[PDB]
Amino acid sequence: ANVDEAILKRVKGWAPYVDAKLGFRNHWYPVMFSKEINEGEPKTLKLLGENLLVNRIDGKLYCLKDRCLHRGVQLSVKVECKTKSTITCWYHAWTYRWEDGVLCDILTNPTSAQIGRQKLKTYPVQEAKGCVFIYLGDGDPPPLARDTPPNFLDDDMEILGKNQIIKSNWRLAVENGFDPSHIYIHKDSILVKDNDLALPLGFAPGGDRKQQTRVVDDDVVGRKGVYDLIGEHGVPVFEGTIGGEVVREGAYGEKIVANDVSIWLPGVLKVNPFPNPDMMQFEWYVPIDENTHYYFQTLGKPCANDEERKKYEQEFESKWKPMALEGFNNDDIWAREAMVDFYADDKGWVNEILFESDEAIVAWRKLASEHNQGIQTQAHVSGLEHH
Template sequence: MSNVSEDILKKVKGWPGYVDAKYGFRNHWYPVMFSKDIAEGEVKKIKLLGEPLLVKRIDGKLHCIKDRCLHRGVPLSEKLDCMTKDTITCWYHAWTYKWETGELCDIMTNPSSAQIGRHKLKVYPVEEAKNCVFIFLGDGEPHPLAHDTPPEFLDDGLEILGIAREIKSNWRLGVENGFDPSHIYIHKDAILVQGNDLVLPLGFAPGEDRSKQTKVIADDSEGGRKGVYDLIGDASVPVFEGTIDGELVREGNYGSTLVANNISIWLPGVLKVNPWPNPDMMQFEWYVPVDENTHIYFQTLGKKCETEEEIKAYEHSFDHKWKKMALMGFNDDDIWAREAMVDFYADDKGWVNEILFEPDEAIVEWRKLADKHNKGIQTLENIKG
């Protein structure tokens, strides 16, 4: 069953599956928290692609199960009850499940029940990498985590630090805001621009050949990753002088720090900007679907560090400079921009009524790639199942 009306999907040209994916793409890896945020023995309640989940760390390893008792469908998280390290018991009728396998191993209210051993809660693979916790929300054996992370993210020596925030907009508005070549206009007054003396035009006037504005990676040339490179900076003219009726009303920033030379977006919805926000750093940010109205803005910065001293210095600069100036001071503009788009796309008619212009070529190519190469559209049936 479709998540969007058939009438809307018939009107959308080129990417109906993308429009239908308001809950995200199934059978992909998504970051849900940082490793430091879940201690040994701790249980975390999360929602991913509309599905309620529970995550627990047992003997250092993370396990993920669906937050729904098989008996009467109540959420186990309503009153967490882990009487043994390896199990979770439903507070309602004492159905008890193994964290590792999801197996219904005991029913304390009826120890001889024929249901014991016959049923399993859905469990999902979990991996930790670069201080981040990833969950594979899907069916069957997962593909390698590297397929759903941008190039360089998993490289040895790249230290990753970041923050995560819940944003009240659909995940696709987050992706398209981040990968939008012309949206830099909203950042013209951001503290980072002057604070780090950035070169930042108001926008870009595309060149004669718009086909050179993007590069689509749909084969295995990037190790199984699928994505789109935004090349508008190379194939266009940066606009530093903003005019209205021929009168100069605004200028871009003619700074000395050149960044954002390489921008790309990757399935299932993660942006890479290199370098950013400084020439020796790069930014990776995910737009993780929580449900149809909310996403986790999972922001990370990476920097090559060779020694413990360099790591500590990077952690200090992250905490005292980059988190406030870049991830918040700069990217807070992106948050209110996404939230400002919500009403227009809320009834799905925005996908039909929008009027795109020349710099949106990158967004168009992303929609086409995501429509064709995603590994499954999350549906209400999956969520309720």
């Protein structure tokens, strides 16, 4: 366990989730865009606490753990790729093949018994929609579709996005994103006025608990997620009051967005439609270490031809990226950072005082606890231990 047993014993509905401080192992995760990794130029990154190296050889991507088997140094301190298909540690020259991680040569001692007998950890890598996904897990990987939201992989869906490192645990990011009432922090966003959006301040719940969401565990692709259906029976809040007096109003724009919100394992949100009635937003909160995550944002829009793609790319750069991804989502960044202290000692998972709209978050916590493919532990990071 990554958390005090006394705390886990208290959280009977989603202890696995509370214990998953380092993220879920055995799932695909996006870490960068295809255009960021060039042929023969190894790139470093940390995923679920593990230092990795990604390289492109003959157009295909390969992933090796960035830690020599010998004395545990990062090969990336001084990259020495002496042949197209290998990488040689700069320290004692142990050489590994990118395709299977096998220790194939040792320049400092070509007669060593370790040659051909040791293997450096490799991870599956797949590119899709111009995004680089890494299967941080063991054994043959499942289809990428299992860990992606519906429609992301659609043939005509043009995907454009942005990625950055944010200082907060991945779970705080997920819950902020799937939070129905957090919409309040976006009330003064430039996207609201500049794109004439209809955006309430909150929601007055309606119907029973079960009706508040739609848990997906019957998806043929294997996807596991939760749909937020708070707006189906609830009354949108457009006039906020204190003591019966109106103190704030929502946005009364013509554009209707975000009437379909869903969270999917391992941790990717889908907002449809957004930021425009003809688009969709898919964003991942990828675990880097217990205190940080990649906020991998993508916006999808159907495009039947290059002209449409170019047109879309142009408006993305000029409007969508700056007005939405940044203009709208920037407040989510410091919002996440604001919850760090309460949950930092793991006590927040016990002392939080939830209200009606959090029923969606609770559904997600239970779904994640029940359907994740594994709990990443520090032991996975240092080296598995067992007697």
